Amino acid sequence: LPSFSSFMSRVLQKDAEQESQMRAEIQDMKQELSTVNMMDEFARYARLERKINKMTDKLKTHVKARTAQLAKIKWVISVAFYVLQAALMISLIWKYY
Template sequence: MNVAVVILFILLCTKLLRKLLEKASKHLVSLVVRKTSETTRLRRDVEELKKKLADVSAQDEFAYHARLQRKLNKVTEDFKTSTSNDQTFAWKTRLVMKGTIMVSMFLTHVAVVWWFWTDIVLSVPANFLYPMDGLLAYPVGKSGDVGAPAWVLLSSHALEFTFCLLNHSRQQLSTSQVKTKS
């Protein structure tokens, strides 16, 4: 089988797996980072205190109203702190997952280059790639040949560009469908 096709297939599979894992990680983070019972309790307390505060007249029962207002302010501050902690944990979890995905992609690229290091991936007539032929043929060294490092780099960027174009065209299609329905 042609080395160029094998490398392209491996890179395509890893890119598809990366996209799948990125989408799955969003759902995984939402499962891992559930709202804590403390956050839920604080939200309920804030709503109850707001209802009580709305029922109490500030002019008739000033002391009770002021006490409720202080309590509401304290519970609201605790709620904000708890929510902030949850959001920070979710952000850190997403960061670790994205970092893991990126490291695995890097290691896959390195492994592919290593496996096919001495193989000629693509041969074209000599001087066809004139200004860049030495760089493209790096480990092989013959003019007109393309080595694995250059092929992995070019294929990876071509696939990323293709995915970007597909995503952009899908977004335009969904936008035009929304406008048509309106």
């Protein structure tokens, strides 16, 4: 488990870079928004929420799909685990025979 987690993270570093930079700028402009008047700039302000929503929801659904394939990799490692029980099973089999 720890070893595999190390490998998955080391390959998933591309995701861990992109998600980081994205959310980073996200808060950057969220703070910008917080410094935007709600009476003389509502138009640009509205462009900004629409942008935030599009970015967030799209990448977020992407995250659902990524975590889906991730749980598929947990199910193939669970198959690997079931192979390790079959392994130790044949081990006792030969310990007898």
